[PDB]
């Protein structure tokens, strides 16, 4: 059973799939597609969208998975990272929802020239971004554990760190001296998962 | 127990919470907040965002739930509408993800001056809207049952009907003589759930 994570963007939507697998201690192969080869690769991907995950058993049979956060939730559920109670499940989804709202602001900046980019970044960093970071800070405070939901790793944790890194991609100093719970979350996450600590260092 | 669904909106994000409860045969109270009353209501809502769900027990204890699709997933999970196996769960999340991509196109048209709204409606209906509808059609085909995932109601079913109604909101004729599996899905869904059939007329 061989897992291939097929994607173009190293900083993209595959991050949540890769981090789930890393934290789960699961081997996989990264297959990165270049812009140049995409037109030729597209018709070979069911649904024609990346990221996608190709799973090949030892009899050469192929199962395809599409929709990156659906894949990540499947892999997370399989390896006990989607909450241990229905209440924890709710809170996992709550924080994923909140991080996706933040991610969607980051998305407004993508594929622009110098400006719109500069103009968008400025609008989002003064608008919804700080509101959303505050909401996430309070969700983290309300955890019954040291992590986003309880004390052990969930998808909510990995989705969060990926989205924060996009925020800092826009303004590296944006969270400096602020959102201590968010910095504290990352410290704590890296402690609970040497694997992810290792992966993120590399 | 007493469930209150607090929202704007209407044809908004509350639809998936309400449809889930309706399909689960769970009673609840709708509390609709006017634009005029929102400034005074906001500080009483944790996180200051709607939709939100206020749950009051017999002892007058108050539990708040936020993030509408996290709420919808909680309620769906509690009532066996999130798939019966891990593969069914992945497929529920797959279709939810696909419908939300469609929903995001619909969102580009909201709160616009009619000028650019007309321009946006025209832009998406020729762009990603039919691409996404085709993807959803193929997802429905791949179901092992008559509904989006298997033969029984899941959150994916309700998210799909809500989003398709938004598309027809933009162009009431867009799916006429097209996407037969989508028409077929809705045919089937109302059959499988007399409760929802009722709600969707009433």
3-class secondary structure per residue, A57-112? CCCCCEEEEECHHHHHHHHHHHCCCCCCCHHHHHHHHHHHHHHHHHHHHHHCCCCC
Six token digits for residue B145? 């049952």
Strands A52-56 and A29-32 come out as: unpaired
Task: Check: CB of residue A156 under 8 Å from CB of residue A76.
Answer: no
Please give the resolution of this entry in Å, rounded to 1 decimal: 2.0
Integer angstrom CA distances of residue A157 from A41, A95, A165, B111: 32, 8, 13, 33
Six token digits for residue A109? 């900046």
Q: What is the C-alpha end-to-end distance of chain B, expressed in Å? A: 24
Q: How many residues appear in chain A?
A: 202
The per-residue b/e assignment along A25-63, b for 16 or more CB within 10 angstroms, e otherwise, is eeebeebebeeeeeeeeeeebebebbbbbbeeeeeeeee
DSSP B59: T
Residue recorded with tokens 């607090």: B6
Task: Check: CB of residue B65 under 8 Å from CB of residue B53.
Answer: yes
Task: Check: CB of residue B32 under 8 Å from CB of residue B10.
Answer: yes
Task: List the beta bridge partners of residue B6.
Answer: B31, B52
Q: How far apart are CA B145 and CA B153, in angstroms?
A: 10
The secondary structure element, H or E, covering residue A164 is helix A155-170
In chain A, domain spans: 1-80, 81-202
Q: How far apart are CA A7 and CA A126, in angstroms?
A: 32
* Ligand-binding site membership of B64 (annotated): no
DSSP A34: P
Query: 3-class SS at A10?
Result: coil
Task: Check: CB of residue B159 under 8 Å from CB of residue B95.
Answer: yes
Q: Classify residue B27 as exposed, middle or buried by CB count within 10 Å of its CB (0-12, 13-18, 19+).
A: exposed
Q: How far apart are CA A77 and CA A88, in angstroms?
A: 12
Task: Check: CB of residue B49 under 8 Å from CB of residue B33.
Answer: no
Closest CA to A11 of A94, A134, A95, A107: A107
**Partner-chain contact B66 A90, CB within 8 Å:** no
DSSP B63: E
**Partner-chain contact A67 B93, CB within 8 Å:** yes
Phi, psi of A173 (to 5 degrees): -100, 5
Technique that determined the structure: X-ray
Q: How far apart are CA A59 and CA A176, in angstroms?
A: 52
Task: Check: CB of residue B147 under 8 Å from CB of residue B189.
Answer: yes
**Partner-chain contact B70 A97, CB within 8 Å:** yes
Of B49, B89, B97, the CB nearest to A69: B97
Cis amide bond preceding A83, omega within 30: no
B47 at A interface, C-beta within 8 A? yes
The secondary structure element, H or E, covering residue A196 is helix A194-201
Of A65, A77, A86, the CB nearest to B89: A77
* Ligand-binding site membership of B67 (annotated): yes
Six token digits for residue B45? 């809502």
Count CA within 13 A, CB hemisphere, residue B107. 9
Phi, psi of A63 (to 5 degrees): -110, 135
Q: How far apart are CA A24 and CA A96, in angstroms?
A: 18
Six token digits for residue B64? 């708040």
The fold for domain B1-80 equals Glutaredoxin (3.40.30)
Q: What is the C-alpha end-to-end distance of chain A, expressed in Å? A: 26
Task: Check: CB of residue A139 under 8 Å from CB of residue A94.
Answer: yes
Closest CA to B66 of B41, B45, B37, B81: B45
Closest CA to A102 of A82, A130, A122: A130
Q: How far apart are CA A20 and CA A165, in angstroms?
A: 16
Closest CA to B123 of B147, B138, B105: B105
**Partner-chain contact B90 A97, CB within 8 Å:** no
Q: How far apart are CA A87 and CA B5, in angstroms?
A: 18
Q: How far apart are CA B139 and CA B93, in angstroms?
A: 11
Query: 3-class SS at B31?
Result: strand
Binding residues of A for glutathione: 7, 13, 38, 42, 50, 67-68, 101
Q: Classify residue B98 as exposed, middle or buried by CB count within 10 Å of its CB (0-12, 13-18, 19+).
A: buried
Q: How far apart are CA B59 and CA A149, in angstroms?
A: 27
The fold for domain B81-202 equals Glutathione S-transferase Yfyf (Class Pi); Chain A, domain 2 (1.20.1050)
Count CA within 13 A, CB hemisphere, residue B25. 5
């Amino acid at each position: 059973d061989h897992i291939k994570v097929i994607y173009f963007n190293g900083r993209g939507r595959a991050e949540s799939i890769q981090m789930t697998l890393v934290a789960a201690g699961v081997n996989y192969e990264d297959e990165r597609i270049s812009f140049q080869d995409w037109p030729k690769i597209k018709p070979t991907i069911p649904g024609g969208r990346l990221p996608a995950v190709k799973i090949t058993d030892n009899h050469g049979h192929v199962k395809w998975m599409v929709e990156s956060l659906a894949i990540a939730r499947y892999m997370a559920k399989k390896h006990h990272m989607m909450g241990g109670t229905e209440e924890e499940y709710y809170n996992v989804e709550k924080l994923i929802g909140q991080a996706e709202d933040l991610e969607h602001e980051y998305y407004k900046t993508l594929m622009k020239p110098e400006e719109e980019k500069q103009k968008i970044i400025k609008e989002i960093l003064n608008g919804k971004v700080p509101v959303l970071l505050d909401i996430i800070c309070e969700s983290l405070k309300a955890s019954t554990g040291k992590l986003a939901v309880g004390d052990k790793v969930t998808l909510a944790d990995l989705v969060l760190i990926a989205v924060i890194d996009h925020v800092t991609d826009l303004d590296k100093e944006f969270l400096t001296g602020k959102y201590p719970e968010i910095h504290k979350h990352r410290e704590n996450l890296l402690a609970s998962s040497p694997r992810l600590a290792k992966y993120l260092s590399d």
